[PDB]
Design a protein around this ligand. Structure first.
Ligand code: NA
Ligand code: NA
Ligand code: NA
Ligand code: NA
Lengths: 131, 157, 155, 131
């Protein structure tokens, strides 16, 4: 699974996820990547792409969940991604990357590693696998 | 109030990742992020940026999508992808692709040209050809690393 | 506490729908509801009730699932379904089914047997046959009124 | 699209949706009914099944939304459903049916009709097409 989330200078959010799926899967099995609200979501206020155990991401509607907690709990991006990873997974292993319409970028995951990189216009730039 | 971008190449990393591969992965993420930065510096819309970055992630054989994708039990590639544009929550998704060089761009075309938001398998392969996108033999997507990985997967019992 | 159940047969009703179709749709809804009510009355779990009610809705040709399903442009049927059990949020989904008599029950089997939560198209058709469910020719699902409707869709 | 939501005596919720999809659709086209969180959702507090314009249900993750506004805004079932319907279809057309773990049952829709029936153990019972 790979992915990208972007907020441009106009404050418009977008998200995109692609995968080959699970090794040794049988034909016709579909995971979370193509499923709106699970692996990929974007709206007025954010853009999210998820990766990890599709079972957990699907039942947890994980990407839409970032948007829902911003919306209905009034949390800002970082705290919302924090909330989702911490409360909407337990025993499930997943991670996600997100942007807000305000120009923030956040990543979160609850396994051992996640290949990710982020940047913002004023010059923050990080590429990381571990914590 | 400015641009921001994140890219990922998957969760689930094994702590014994060799240094070699660690460095490749970082080099690839940098390259893809820089492509995205550069498109954002020159005022390319968010929706075009995500597609552009993910196409590069698909092309590179290192991570699990596009060429370098995980293999099915029969040893072939079946790919899937989705895309969403936030301002009007416009969605496109594709599954069961075996021939489409860049699934994410097909997902983009579902979003823009289809009355549906998700097309899969034969239908989706038929839509690709109607849309004129690049299509290739399934073998194209299959690398030696993954043939080995699937050997192990199947040994795993 | 106390049990509760809702059934639907789709949104968007033609305001032209004639009184006898109205009565038929209501007689179907009532039959399905009553099956669920007795099941709830003999304490069968929620998850078995929603399957059993939806299987009745699939079998009756009136509404757009199972037999009586809407037709593709080629005049055939492709069905899909999902099911979810709240207590542990277990999910199962299927699409692209062409020979499976009761799609919702195949969804349930995806929930309960598959390491995946969604199987589709030929993989779903091979899954059905591994699970030994009832499979039929596609024609079985195609009704004459839907054949007529399709011909109208084609403006 | 047909569907059923149930809450049982022990308080467990469950939901199920099935369809033939849109008339005259081309092969391989997939709607909201098999999409968890869009067409179908059940959790500890509720069970939900949606029907109507697939595009509007998918983009709003509408089945999950009902659960979300219950959980994050503390609305009861009827209010939850009223809210999602009146305030989360910006122009799309849909309906839904739901149950709560407390034993409530609700239906709502913004288009001109919805084939539905509902019952509670207390005695309530209703079968309808229009208002
Ligand atoms: Na690749
Ligand atoms: Na579309
Ligand atoms: Na039927
Ligand atoms: Na499963």
């Amino acid at each position: 699974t790979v992915g990208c989330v972007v907020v441009d200078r106009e404050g418009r959010c977008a998200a995109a996820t692609s995968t080959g799926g699970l090794m040794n899967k049988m034909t016709g099995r579909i995971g979370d990547s193509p499923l709106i609200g699970a692996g990929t979501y974007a709206c007025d206020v954010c853009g999210v792409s998820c990766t990890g155990e599709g079972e957990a991401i699907i039942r947890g509607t994980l990407a839409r969940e970032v948007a829902a907690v911003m919306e209905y709990k009034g949390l800002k991006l970082h705290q919302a991604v924090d909330f989702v990873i911490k409360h909407r997974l337990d025993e499930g292993k997943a991670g996600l990357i997100a942007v807000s319409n305000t120009g923030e970028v956040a990543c979160g995951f609850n396994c051992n590693g996640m290949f990710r990189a982020c940047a913002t216009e004023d010059g923050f730039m990080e590429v990381a696998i571990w914590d | 109030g400015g641009w921001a971008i994140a890219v990922h190449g998957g969760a689930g990393v094994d702590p014994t990742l060799p240094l070699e591969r660690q460095e490749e992965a970082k080099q690839l993420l940098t390259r893809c992020l820089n492509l995205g930065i550069s498109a954002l510096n020159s005022n390319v819309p968010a929706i075009d940026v995500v597609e552009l970055v993910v196409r590069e992630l698909e092309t590179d054989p290192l991570f699990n999508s596009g060429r370098g994708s995980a293999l099915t039990e029969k040893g072939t590639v079946e790919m899937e992808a989705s895309i969403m544009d936030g301002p009007k929550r416009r969605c496109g998704a594709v599954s069961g692709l075996t021939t489409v060089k860049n699934p994410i761009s097909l997902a983009r075309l579902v979003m823009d040209k289809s009355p549906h938001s998700y097309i899969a398998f034969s239908g989706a392969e038929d839509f690709a050809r109607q849309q004129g996108v690049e299509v290739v033999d399934n073998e194209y997507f299959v690398t030696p690393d993954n043939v080995g990985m699937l050997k192990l997967a199947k040994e795993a019992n």
